[PDB]
Design a protein around this ligand. Structure first.
Ligand SMILES: CN1CCN(c2cc(C(F)(F)F)cc(C(F)(F)F)c2OC(=O)N(C)c2ccc(F)cc2)C1=O
Ligand SMILES: Nc1nc2c(ncn2[C@H]2CC[C@@H](COP(=O)(O)OP(=O)(O)OP(=O)(O)O)O2)c(=O)[nH]1
Ligand SMILES: [Mg+2]
Length: 631
DNA sequence: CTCCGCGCTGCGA
DNA sequence: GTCGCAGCGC
């Protein structure tokens, strides 16, 4: 290809800037390499392509008159949008590039963004995580020999951003620039064909921008809170070990399923219930007989909490010197089958719910272990959690129009406490969090295709009894099953399911021969038709909330922006985490009211349904100590 | 072979 | 290493 080193002659550089200021669409690729003496990232330059196999390299490390500050001035001049300039930038791994640009160059991009990976996921949510090699092979094969010059393109990291390759930063960035530009033109052609370009440019890419702002913010984390909770949990763990070995007369292994099987079903004559299964469903039923199953469940819960939540967060914590805080910086991921947004490194979505452990000799003492309490706002701030009240159920009500579901939605009573009251034959006010959560699983499973076998095994009852429960549900809420049958019919005639925004989940297995294959495909259809719609509504809410918060301004978009500027008082909302039906923000005090009215008004007014979207706003000094807000 | 769904992560074979 | 299993979250 033609790599044009624009920063080599002054006339060449000025003509390059002249041409660049005319373009309405161009690709961008950062050129990161190693710090000579160790190994760390260093932005050596950048690459721009606006057509053909020509990549313009903007060196940032040889006309001496082009001082680096002049180059940065022209860079910010070309990268910042103005009034109705309608520029569309194309970058691979848009969030990482935005973060690295803002943090290593002080450049806040303001143009419209187009990511090829997001387009690939939109065309097929079940597709593998797109790599530059995969995109080039599937959409721009004739230029694949370019990537044949190396093997780094086989990774999800940007080729130009991958400093590990023996190739130079310039060559990698140039190749990525041209390839991403042309492959994005092809992907845009396909998206326009399938009427999904709108959802790509108005919902998904702005959501990626909000995700980048979140990742720049990071969630605050208190280490002393984690220390205290971990000490209590380890004390209770040792107590559980000693008490269980006393109750068993010998030392078993809580991980060894055969050890506990021998202890329960043989040494203690506990009734099996094919048999000799030490699963959670069987131990929950056996808890009502001997204390040891409950102790094993508590041991497993505490061990999971302290090995898969405590230590990862304690290792992933970083100091934010400008804020005087210790924040956790997770990574976003939207490449999911149903459009939901998950997190990684660490998954602060999987933080355990609030549970209690009783310690003491005479009946113990209650000690609440809320791991979500170690997440706190900045000094003088407030965590603000806005939750969609029964989002998927309202979506199913708008779809199926089963008047019983609409009625029980209008009544305003916990349908899971209702299930548990019909289940255990108790009062709904007596249903605790554990039993209500079991009932929530029962509810959503039965709605999405739970079998009588698993329903009975979880309910602690027989198969033919859970069958009666399923038939009762189907007789009561009839429009739901009518719409489920219509959905399998539509996905069988069409071969795919379509969410509310028009996204497509391609499920060919709905016409498979194996009954399990067909059943799983039908269940995936009936699930995704609602789950992806919920994710889409959450995304629309998020992007409108961010736009509204940016309207009032007098506020830094992300934290990263404000610490980059400092190198000022905090005053505004800050995206920190997104539960799949609930948004979390970190609002400064003076705005905890205003921002709240922004989150509730947008979330309610994110999409028009036959059932109004109910939102519940809570404010607190931590994600664990949240109390309802007025708004 | 085998019957709610989406997701992550540590440990073990 | 790679993946499966089982723990948890929505
Ligand atoms: C009069 N009650 C109480 C609860 N409930 C209900 C409501 C919904 C919803 F979401 F549409 F409102 C769903 C379910 C089901 F079946 F999906 F779990 C519901 O439970 C059922 O109907 N049964 C038959 C049921 C009850 C307890 C179980 F252990 C299993 C099944 C009612 O209608
Ligand atoms: N298919 C399925 N979906 C689930 C399951 N648990 C949660 N979800 C989905 C559907 C509801 C949504 C929100 O989860 P919550 O646990 O926050 O549930 P909720 O019923 O919306 O509200 P609440 O906060 O009152 O418990 O996530 C589950 O076991 N199966
Ligand atoms: Mg909820």
């Amino acid at each position: 290809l033609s790599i044009i080193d624009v920063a080599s002659d002054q006339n060449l550089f000025q003509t390059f800037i002249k041409e660049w200021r005319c373009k309405k669409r161009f690709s961008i690729s950062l050129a990161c390499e190693k710090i000579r003496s160790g190994d760390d990232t260093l932005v050596v330059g950048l690459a721009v392509c606006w057509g053909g196999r020509d990549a313009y390299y903007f060196s940032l490390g040889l006309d001496p008159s082009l001082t680096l500050k002049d180059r940065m001035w022209y860079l910010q001049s070309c990268l910042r949008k103005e009034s109705d300039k309608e520029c569309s930038v194309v970058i691979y791994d848009f969030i990482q590039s935005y973060k690295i640009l803002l943090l290593s160059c002080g450049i806040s991009l303001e143009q419209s963004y187009e990511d090829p990976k997001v387009a690939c996921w939109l065309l097929d949510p079940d597709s593998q995580e797109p790599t530059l090699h995969s995109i080039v092979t599937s959409f721009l094969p004739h230029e694949l020999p370019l990537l044949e010059g190396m093997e780094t393109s086989q990774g999800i990291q940007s080729l130009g951003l991958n400093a590990g390759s023996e190739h130079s930063g310039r060559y990698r960035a140039s190749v990525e620039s041209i390839l991403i530009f042309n492959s994005m033109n092809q992907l845009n052609s396909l998206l326009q064909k399938e009427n999904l370009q709108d959802v790509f440019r108005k919902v998904e890419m702005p959501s990626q921008y909000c995700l980048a702002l979140l990742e720049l913010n990071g969630i605050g984390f208190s280490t002393a809170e984690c220390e205290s909770q971990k000490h209590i949990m380890q004390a209770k763990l040792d107590a559980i070990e000693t008490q269980a070995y006393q109750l068993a007369g010998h030392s078993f292994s809580f991980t060894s399923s055969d050890d506990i099987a021998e202890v329960l079903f043989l040494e203690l004559k506990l009734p099996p219930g094919g048999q000799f299964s030490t699963s959670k469903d069987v131990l929950n039923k056996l808890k009502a007989l001997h204390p040891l199953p409950g102790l094993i469940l508590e041991w497993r819960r505490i061990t999971n909490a302290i090995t898969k939540v405590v230590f990862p967060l304690q290792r992933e914590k970083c100091l934010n010197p400008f804020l005087g805080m210790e924040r956790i910086y997770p990574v976003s991921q939207s490449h999911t089958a149903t459009g939901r947004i998950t997190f990684t490194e660490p998954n602060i979505q999987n933080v355990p719910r609030d549970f209690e452990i009783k310690m003491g000799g005479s009946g113990g003492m209650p000690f609440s272990i809320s791991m979500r309490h170690a997440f706190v706002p900045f000094p003088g701030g407030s965590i603000l959690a806005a939750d969609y009240s029964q989002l998927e159920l309202r979506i199913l009500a708008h779809l199926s129009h089963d008047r019983r579901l609409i009625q029980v939605l209008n009544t305003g009573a916990d349908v899971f406490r209702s299930i548990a009251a019909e289940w255990k034959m108790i009062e709904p006010e007596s249903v605790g969090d554990d039993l209500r959560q079991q009932a929530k699983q029962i509810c959503y499973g039965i709605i999405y295709g739970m079998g009588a076998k698993s329903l009975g095994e979880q309910m602690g009852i027989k198969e033919n009894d859970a069958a009666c429960y399923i038939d009762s549900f189907k007789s009561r809420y009839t429009g739901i099953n009518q719409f489920m049958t219509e959905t399998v019919k539509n996905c069988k005639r069409d071969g795919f399911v379509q969410t509310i925004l028009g996204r497509r989940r391609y499920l060919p297995g709905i016409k498979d021969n194996n009954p399990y294959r067909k059943a799983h495909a039908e269940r995936q259809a009936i699930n995704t038709i609602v789950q992806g719609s919920a994710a889409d509504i959450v995304k629309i809410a998020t992007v409108n909330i961010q736009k509204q918060l940016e309207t009032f301004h007098s506020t830094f978009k992300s934290h990263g922006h404000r610490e980059g500027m400092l190198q000022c008082p905090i005053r505004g909302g800050f995206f920190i985490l997104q539960l799949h039906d609930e948004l979390l923000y970190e609002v400064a005090e003076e705005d905890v009211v205003q921002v709240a009215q922004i989150v509730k008004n947008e979330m309610e007014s994110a999409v028009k349904l036959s059932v109004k979207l109910k939102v519940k706003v809570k404010i607190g000094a931590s994600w664990g100590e949240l109390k309802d807000f007025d708004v």
